[PDB]
Amino acid sequence: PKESILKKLEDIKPEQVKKQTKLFRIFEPRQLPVYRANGEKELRNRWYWKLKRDTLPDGDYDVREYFLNLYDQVLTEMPDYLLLKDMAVENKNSRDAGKVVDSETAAICDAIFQDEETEGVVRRFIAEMRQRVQADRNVVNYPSILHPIDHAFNEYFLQHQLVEPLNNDIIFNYIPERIRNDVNYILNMDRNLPSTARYIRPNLLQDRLNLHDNFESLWDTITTSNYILARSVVPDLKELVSTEAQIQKMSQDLQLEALTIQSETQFLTGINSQAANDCFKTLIAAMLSQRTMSLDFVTTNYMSLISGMWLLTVVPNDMFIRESLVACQLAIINTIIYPAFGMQRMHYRNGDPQTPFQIAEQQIQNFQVANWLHFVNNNQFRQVVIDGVLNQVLNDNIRNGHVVNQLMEALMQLSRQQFPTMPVDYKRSIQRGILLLSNRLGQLVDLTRLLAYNYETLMACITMNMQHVQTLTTEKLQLTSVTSLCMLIGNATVIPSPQTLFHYYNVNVNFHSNYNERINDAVAIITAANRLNLYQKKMKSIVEDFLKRLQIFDISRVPDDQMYRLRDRLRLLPVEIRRLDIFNLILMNMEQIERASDKIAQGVIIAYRDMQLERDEMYGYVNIARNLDGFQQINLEELMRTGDYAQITNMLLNNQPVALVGALPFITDSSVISLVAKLDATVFAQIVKLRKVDTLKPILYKINSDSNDFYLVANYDWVPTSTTKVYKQIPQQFDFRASMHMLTSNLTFTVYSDLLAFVSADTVEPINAVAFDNMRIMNEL
Amino acid sequence: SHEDYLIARELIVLSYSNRSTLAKLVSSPMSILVALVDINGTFITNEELELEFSNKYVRAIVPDQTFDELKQM
C-alpha cells in the first residue's frame, strides 16, 4: 500500500497541454428555398444559419442540462494555445492563392462559387479573401466565416490563451530563491533559448478550501502522501562510523561485560543502522509534511531517555503527540533530574493541562537545567510567509547549533550532583550513560546543523502552505532510533542532489496545479448549475470525479457528508476568468441557440379567435408568433413539479385565451385541408383526460406551393386565418460578407512544458558544505 | 503451477536434442531485463556494511537499441 502511493504521485503527469485542429462551431449555413409573398416559390434558393447536431431535449430543465453539457464540451475543448497555420488550408477560388483557417470554411467558399444562384459580389469577396502575415512581429491574420457566437468563443480562445514568453532568465526564476542563493550548489545550462519560444505557467494558487479546518480524513491522507514522498528524497546516511567498534566502546566504558552484544536490555537493543536512518528520514519528512509522530519506547532503557532530551530540544514539542512525550518527559524528570537534587520522584496527574517540563521548570533551582527546560518548553516553530508560502521554520538557534551547549551544561551539572536517595551503582550507570553523550557532543552539534540544513533545503521545494495541525494517524518513532543516530554518526555530510530537489519540486508543482485546476472545474460546474436553476441535480458524482482525479484517495471509504461540505465550501469560490467569461457568453446566448433548432418550440399560444398567419419567407404562411405579448402565460416546468392541472383544465374547458411556455416539440403539416379542418385545436383534449403533458405536439401550418392544395389561396382571395398560433422564431439569414472575420494569431511559437530539464546542476564537495552562518557543518573530529 | 508445466514441456522436449545452445541462450536476455524495472522502495548498504532501507524511487532509462538486441535474442 505504501509504495503504491508514491507510484501514483510520481505518475502524476502535468495538465496535458491542449491544441485544437479545428474551430468550435454550433451553426452552419444551409440552403433552403424562399417563397415570395402570396406564398408561391422562387426559382432561387437561399442560405440560412441552422444548428449543427440538433439534439435539444424536450422540457426546459432538460434544455438547461443540454447547455450545461455544451459548457462541458466547450471547457473540454477550451485550449491553452494554438497555431492557426497548422489548421489552415487553401482556398480554391482566391485571386492570390491565399488560405483560410478551417476546412469547412473553405468548403463553404468553394460551394458558393459554384452555385448559379449566388451574386457576383460574394464571388469577388472570395477572390479577394486571403491570408496575411507580418513576420517582424510573428503575427498572422487568416480569414474565417463564423457565426457571431462562434466568433465570440473562438476570439476568446485567441485572446485568452495561456502562454508566456520564455527566455533564459525565467528558467532561473522558476527555481526557489534559496537554492539560487545557496552557495553549496552550482547551476548552468548548455542552450540559449530564443524569444520565439513559449512556456505555460502552473496554477500555484494556495488552498481555497482550508482542508486543515475540519476535513481531517482527507488531510490525513494528504499529509501521509507528502510524508512518504519526502521519504523518497531525504538522503540515505551513506557514510557512518562503525557499529561493532562503537558498541565495544560502549561495553568497555560501561562495565557490563563480557558478551553484552547478545544480552540487550540496558542502554542498547536498538543501536543498529536500520533505525538511525529511520529517525533521520522520519524527522525531516514529518516536519516537512507536518505529520505528528508518536513514540514507542521502554523505560528500562535509559540511553533512549537520554537521547530523547536531544530530540525534544532540537525538535519542537508541539510537533509530537501529547501522551507520548508526556510519558517521556515524566520518565526523564522522575529518574534523571529530580533524583539529582534529592527531590521527590513526582506526583503527576493524568489529565493535567501542562507538561512535566513546564511545571518542573519552576520547581528545581539550577541555572543550567532551568534555562535548558525554558528553551525546551518555549521551543516552537516560527511561522513565516516566504515566496508566498507559509513555512514552519526552526528557531535560528537550533540551526547554528548551540542548544546542545545548554544541554551539555545541564548534563554536566547532573553529573556533578549526588543521588542521596539512591545507591552508588545506579548513579554510576546514569552518569556513564550521559558521559557517553558528552563524548559525542561535537557530532551531535553537526547532526543538528545537518538536519536543519537539509530540512530548509527541502522546504524550498514546496508550493502548498505547510500548516501545523495534529492528525489522526501517526508515524512511530522508537527512541532507540534516535540513540542509534546520535551514536552512529560522524564526518560524513550528505547534501540532497539538485536533481532530487528538482524532482520533488516538479512533483509538488504538478500536484498543486492538478489540485487548483480541478477545483476550478468543480467550482465552474457548481456555479453554473446553481445559476441555471438545476434543482434535481445531485452534486455528488462531480465531487466523486474531483476526488478520483486526485490520485491519492480511496473513494470506496469516503462518505457523502464530506463531499457535500466540500461542495458547500466550493460554492463560495470565485470562478476563474476563462470559465467565467465562457459562462457569461452562454447565459446571453443559450436562448438565441434555443430560438433556433426546428425540433422544439418555446411555446404555443391558444387564443380562440380566428387570427392571421404570418408572411415569413423561408416558409410561406405560418401560424408563428415571435413576441408572446397580450395573452397570459403558463410555465410548464412549474406545472410538472407540482401537478396542479386544475387551472389549465378550467382554462381549456371554458375556451379562455392563454399561452403555454416551455420547450415543446412540433410537427409541420403542409396540408391546407388541415387548416380549415382545424386540427391544431384538436391536440389539447388529451390534457384534460390523461393529465400528463409529455406527448404534446402542436402543429405548424407551413403553406406554400409544395402543399398540393395551395391553388385555393391563388383562386379564392383568402389570407390564411387560423387559431392556436405557435411561439417560435425564424432562422437567421446568411450574409456572406457580414459573416466574414479575420482571426489573429502568433506565427510559429514552440511550447516547452518542462522548464528545469535545461538546467544542469552540481554540488560542492560535501565536506566543505556550509550553512546560513557562513560556517562549516560536519567539522568536529 | 501451469507456467511451470509450460516451461517443463518446452525444455524437456528440446533438451533431448539441443545440448549446446539452450542454457546459454535463454539465460542471456536477463542481463537486459534488469534495466527495465522501476525501483519503488529500496535496500541500501553502508560502507560500514549495514542494511538501511530507502523509499527512493528510480526510473529505468533504457536505450532503444538494446530492445532490438533483445528481440534478436
Binding site: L193, T750, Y752, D754, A757 | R59, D64, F67, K71
Partner: peptide, 28 residues
C-alpha cells in the same frame, strides 16, 4: 506472427518518455 512482433517493437518506443529528451528534441 510478425505483425504482432513489429507492434511489440513499436510499443516500447512511445512508452517511457523522458522529459529532457523531448525538450532538447523540440529545440533540435
Amino acid at each position: 506472427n510478425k505483425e504482432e512482433s513489429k507492434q511489440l517493437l513499436e510499443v516500447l518506443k512511445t512508452k517511457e518518455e523522458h522529459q529532457k529528451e523531448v525538450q532538447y528534441e523540440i529545440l533540435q
